[model samples]
Target: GAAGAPGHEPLLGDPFGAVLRRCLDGGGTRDLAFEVVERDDGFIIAQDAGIYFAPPGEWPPTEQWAVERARGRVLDVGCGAGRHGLALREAGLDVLGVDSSPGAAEVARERGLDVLEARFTELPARLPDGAGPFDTFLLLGNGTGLLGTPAQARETLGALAEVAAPGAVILGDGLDVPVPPDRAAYERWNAERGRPEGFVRIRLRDRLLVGEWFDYAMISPDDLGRVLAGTRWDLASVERAGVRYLATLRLRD
Candidate 1:
């Protein structure tokens, strides 16, 4: 009885949360996938929803690296499945997971993470009393879009700086898209708009559940540096991970 031209719908029920909830509830898995759509001629990408909940024991190299670099009290931004937070906590580091999804927050808590359900954009203020001065801010996974736009990122980083302990570090992953010999149409479009080659505005959907469009910058180290310039944080180093990369930014004194 399914024969209608599909239409996009606003993610009324938190698709990411639903996916995690299903995974947590032992709902039989059958093709857990999602689509990401973007503006400017309609850019799109597909993803497997299961990756958000990768097992703690078999963490991918990128995540393992982030965890190893993590120190002292940690603030796990975008702590989707609480997988990384679980590992960090297991390593004996104090951690507070923050996520924007109500369902994801619940799942994280269910899986043994102390989570705060709020967007990274709403920090310091949204944080509870005596909740901060954390030493590490972890944003693992290439899907982490911590450097969407300079101004927006700065605002968030500024809040982090306020709540950060001295010598705090931010560990995050980003795409290292190429600036090819000819350059792809997508990257060219970003360049034309004064953005990096990998800048993308993306939205997520699983079946009828859709989400708001967001900026997803596939940034280079130079671009990352640009965002941190004049901010309270500075890009300390970047490690290439094939087509992707990991960064460690330190809060300035």
Candidate 2:
């Protein structure tokens, strides 16, 4: 029922972009809703659509602290509507917002922000010539999940190291996925698919659009350390907002 093919990142024809555009078009505050369907069992995870578009003042305290640590030229990955990039640019830092969602990129430009539509994993090679060697990488919005798996996390971080400035810092948000003891079926399902305990495979959908299934990691802070092994990044600190948290990694000299 989705347009994505097996083992390929499917086109996310602006499911998120549609929501962002409405806010731009209406020029008002209105919250929409979306759903994430677990691939194997069809378990539904519903969320308010407004979180992506929230202004900086409304961001969580941990997020506020995370952004403060961003410095110099920034690569804001998964910048849904470019809120963080816009804020950083306003503070006099060069910033670029990147997202895989085309419509999301469209909306960001509408707000007068610089945006590139592409997956973050390709960013090290994807930037236009002379574009980067970024000093900061902002991955707010539970973006560490984009790393996919522990091994994939190392790969992604290693790639970032390739393009980062000598003292570049990566500030990202990581969320823990707690599987309740009663959810035996979910656990068994994940193991069958070779998905680790915190691995998630799901599709995002709005009223009319269903995104392609994608695997992501929502690992705990401890698990995050394990993923950092062998990468050029060193985990400097982690600030927790209960189960939600922020991590700061510095490029090794």
Candidate 3:
């Protein structure tokens, strides 16, 4: 499902977006070779960049885990830019790339993969028609980081488990920062991101938006595990990366 709220930001409100625009305009921002495509929304798209292009790079270990193991009716959650999804397909998996961004879905479609432009929460009903059962659901690139608060994150995790097929895998990631439920720490995080106070900015494929800033609740791997246990999902492995951890889980039933 679309893990969090739906709100718009001021046009070109993201610093990353600004950097992307600069890179796409062919002004030598880096030595990278990429083709830029202009869209109707006044935003540009950079195509065929290296693996570490948009959406950042997964840790080498995580990449190996997925590349070696991601298979058999795989679903890439929030499959932005559809990079991983496309890679899985090229590797011969029956893959489906799902995202809430229409622009990203368009990108995936152009590349000839079936991409769904909808949230993960909507999948139980919307997805069974196309994908019988997903072998794995990848929530990569700080995907768990965007799942609202601790309670809501747990709730969503439970929901995901409910929708998964027996033996389905949940691969998720988030920062490992020990948040003390301190408002100040949260506030500082917002300010550091150039995000406006009291609100969080979101950029959809075609729609950009913002939502109340206090909507997020942060948690650690242990807390998340407790929640997963409550849902009866088996937590199989956890690997650390600075303040972030990439976890793999499985549903028992």
By TM-score, is 1 or 3 better? 1
Candidate 3 vs. true structure, TM-score: 0.64
Number of backbone clashes in candidate 1: 1
Task: Write the candidate numbers in order of decreasing TM-score.
Answer: 2, 1, 3
Query: Candidate 2: which stretches are off by over 4 Å?
Result: 1-12, 33-38, 182-184
Each candidate's lDDT (Cα)? 0.75, 0.77, 0.58
Residue-level lDDT for 251 in candidate 2: 91
On residues 1-253, what C-alpha lDDT tens digit does candidate 1 reach at each position?
3233546434455777776777667632334544345454554556656666666556566678888889888999888878889888887988999988898899889889999998777787789888878999997876336546777787878877888999999998877765654347766777778975466676666666756666776667787787888888888888876877778888878
Better of 1 and 2 by lDDT: 2
Q: Least lDDT summed over 10 consecutive residues: which range in candidate 2?
A: 28-37
Runs of candidate 1 with Cα error greater than 4 angstroms are 1-13, 27-40, 179-183, 188-197
Q: lDDT tens string, model 3, 35-92?
A: 3333222234454323323422444455445546675778888776566677778778
Please estimate how well model 1 matches the true structure, expressed as its whole-model Cα lDDT.
Answer: 0.75
User: Which lDDT value does model 3 have at 32?
Assistant: 47
Task: Report the number of the highest-lDDT candidate.
Answer: 2
Task: Please give the lDDT score for candidate 2.
Answer: 0.77
Encode model 2's per-residue lDDT on 1-253: one tens digit a residue: 6445666544455566666666666652545444345454566666655666678899887678878888888998788888888888889989998888888899888877899898767887788877778999988888787777777777778777887889999999978656676455766778888878777677776655667777766768788787887788888898888788899888996
Strongest candidate by TM-score: 2
**Count of backbone collisions in candidate 2:** 0
